[PDB]
Amino acid sequence: YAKKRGWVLGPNNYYSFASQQQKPEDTTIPSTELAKQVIEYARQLEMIV
Amino acid sequence: AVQKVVVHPLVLLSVVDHFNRIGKVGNQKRVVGVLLGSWQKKVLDVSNSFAVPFDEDDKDDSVWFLDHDYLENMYGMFKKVNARERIVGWYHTGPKLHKNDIAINELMKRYCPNSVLVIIDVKPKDLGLPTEAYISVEEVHDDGTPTSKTFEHVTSEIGAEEAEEVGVEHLLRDIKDTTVGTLSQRITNQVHGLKGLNSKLLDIRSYLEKVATGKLPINHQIIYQLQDVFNLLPDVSLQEFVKAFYLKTNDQMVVVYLASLIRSVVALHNLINNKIANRDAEKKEG
Amino acid sequence: TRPANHRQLTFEEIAKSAKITVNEVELLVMKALSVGLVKGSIDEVDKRVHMTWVQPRVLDLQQIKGMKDRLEFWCTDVKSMEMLVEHQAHDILT
């Protein structure tokens, strides 16, 4: 376990390290492409089918 | 203050004929005429116009002519034929206003106490709203101007009347138009909108590239009044504004989802009603 | 100094750069709000002093140089994002 993995037995414990993230969000990255759906909605609805 | 004017569409056309009268010179001859309107309210009305002789040089823009005698008699005729109407101001046809354009106002403030100009444009290379109007005040500055006198922007719009909507929109039949088309004007309106956004930014950087380097007065006008424009600039995608698009756009998505759910069922009625009428008129014919 | 990114400044940098103590920065900033050269707000559970509006000041050559760089970076993005509307709908809007 000390060589295939880490988990070095120091002072009387196997020690874990950081296993987390930041979770960023923009939610206006879709604002280019959600506009592409809305233009497509009025596209097919206005065309003589 | 006046805070808007209302311009009937009989003028914007009774100017352009006078530009078409003397327009054989071609190169440059500014049209100046007399504007007629109503002493209405804080809001003001514009009804009629007529012309006046005017010429002016290229250098030393202080040699210019308004025939007062022509202005007294012809307005005396229009006062004679129309007692409701009186003078409100003047106009000129120049695309950008000139340096001469303040002494013309300083003449005819003795006719109307608030004499208002209207700039029109015979050639709106801008595809946006033409024919904007100004008014002169005094804004004496920290610099020590004895009289800081420059015109102020006043908003404006095209008026309407029941008889003139008949005659104008009859003449609109020479071209095609979609006023009845829903959402076809709307998609153009953001196209006509953002074209106006790009046009004002290409103009402002042309002013800003000159005043940066080489030649322009660097003065305590716009350069910090335009700094306040940068101060607003909302930070759109941040912490709590995300919960304004995901709590309110999906409200308006359900109403669209409702409206599609009925529109499909409505078009499904027209199937069975046609398919019954198709084969049952066939099976009785044969 | 900071370009309105985290302009919710906490009391410590006010109390350092003005070298007044901690318990007087609130009476200091309420004076500037009362005079009216700033329009921010005051928290106390974090003691962060949010900034909204600054009065406009005089600037010089290199401030215009960055401001055109702000303007060009804003001008060419509007035009690109306006193409993406018309490119999406060519013969749809007449």
Cα distances from C37 to residues C5, C31, C53, in angstroms, run 20, 10, 8
Reading phi first (left if > 0) and then psi (alpha if -120 to 50, else beta), residue A7 is in left
Cβ within 8 Å, pair A39-C89:
yes
Q: How many CB atoms lie within 10 A of CB B268?
A: 10
The rounded distance, in Å, linking the Cα atoms of C81 and C84 is 5
Chain position carrying tokens 């035009």: C79
Q: State whether the Cα torsion C13-C14-C20-C26 is positive or negative.
A: negative
Tell me the residue type at B116: V
Looking at B131-183, list the stretches that DSSP marks H as alpha helix, in order from N- to C-terminal side: 162-171
Closest to C92 (Cβ–Cβ): which among A32, A35, A43?
A43
Nearest of B128, B179, B134, B178 to residue B153 by alpha carbon? B134
Q: Which residues of C touch B180 (CB under 8 A)?
A: none
Q: Which residues of chain C approach chain A closer than 8 Å at the C-beta?
A: 81, 84-85, 88-89, 92
Looking at chain C, list the stretches that DSSP marks H as alpha helix, in order from N- to C-terminal side: 11-17, 25-35, 61-88
Reading phi first (left if > 0) and then psi (alpha if -120 to 50, else beta), residue C42 is in beta
> What residue in B sits closest to C93 (Cα-Cα)?
B184
Cβ within 8 Å, pair C56-B211:
no
> What residue in B sits closest to C63 (Cα-Cα)?
B212
Cβ within 8 Å, pair B184-A28:
no
| Cα within 13 Å of Cα(B178), Cβ side | 11
Nearest of B87, B14, B28, B32 to residue B59 by alpha carbon? B28
The rounded distance, in Å, linking the Cα atoms of C42 and C28 is 12
The rounded distance, in Å, linking the Cα atoms of C89 and C94 is 9
Q: How many CB atoms lie within 10 A of CB B87?
A: 19
What DSSP character marks residue C81? Answer: H
Strand order, beta sheet including C9-10: C9-10, C48-50, C41-42
> Tokens standing for B176?
């095609």
B2 contacts: CB under 8 Å, gap ≥ 6: B42, B43, B44, B114, B116, B135, B154
Closest to A28 (Cβ–Cβ): which among B183, B184, B237?
B237
Looking at chain B, list the stretches that DSSP marks H as alpha helix, in order from N- to C-terminal side: 16-21, 68-81, 103-107, 162-171, 184-212, 227-232, 242-245, 249-285
Q: Strand B32-38 and strand B86-92: pairing?
A: antiparallel
A33 in reach of chain B (CB within 8 A): no
The rounded distance, in Å, linking the Cα atoms of B88 and B46 is 8
> Tokens standing for B83?
């007692």
- Which neighbouring-strand residues pair with B137? B150
The rounded distance, in Å, linking the Cα atoms of B35 and B115 is 9
- Check if the beta carbon of residue B22 is closer than 8 Å to that of residue B40: no
Cβ within 8 Å, pair C72-B195:
no
Q: Which residues of chain A approach chain C closer than 8 Å at the C-beta?
A: 32, 35-36, 39-40, 42-43, 46-47
Q: Which residues of chain B approach chain A closer than 8 Å at the C-beta?
A: 183-184, 187, 236-237, 242, 245-246, 256
| Cα within 13 Å of Cα(B97), Cβ side | 22
B42 contacts: CB under 8 Å, gap ≥ 6: B1, B2, B3
Q: Which residues of A touch C81 (CB under 8 A)?
A: 32
Method for structure elucidation: cryo-EM
Q: Which residues of A touch C92 (CB under 8 A)?
A: 39, 42-43, 46-47
Reading phi first (left if > 0) and then psi (alpha if -120 to 50, else beta), residue B214 is in left
**B195, burial (CB in 10 Å: exposed 0-12, middle 13-18, buried 19+):** middle
The rounded distance, in Å, linking the Cα atoms of B14 and B10 is 6
> Tokens standing for B123?
């050639």
Q: Which residues of A touch C89 (CB under 8 A)?
A: 39, 43
- Give the alpha-carbon dihedral of B43, B47, B52, B56, to 10 degrees: 50
Q: What is the resolution of this structure in A?
A: 3.3
Q: Which residues of C touch A39 (CB under 8 A)?
A: 85, 88-89, 92
- How many Å lie between the alpha carbon of B137 and the closest alpha carbon of chain A? 45
Which of A26, A27, A37 to substitute to test the interface with B, most B CBs within 10 Å?
A: A27
- Which neighbouring-strand residues pair with B152? B135
Cα distances from B27 to residues B21, B24, B52, B92, B201, in angstroms, run 14, 9, 20, 16, 30
The rounded distance, in Å, linking the Cα atoms of B156 and B5 is 5
Q: State whether the Cα torsion B51-B57-B62-B65 is positive or negative.
A: negative
- How many Å lie between the alpha carbon of B224 and the closest alpha carbon of chain C? 5
Q: State whether the Cα torsion B222-C77-A31-B260 is positive or negative.
A: positive
Cβ within 8 Å, pair C57-B227:
yes
- Check if the beta carbon of residue B108 is closer than 8 Å to that of residue B90: yes
Which of B176, B184, B187 to substitute to test the interface with C, most C CBs within 10 Å?
A: B187
B230 contacts: CB under 8 Å, gap ≥ 6: C67, C70
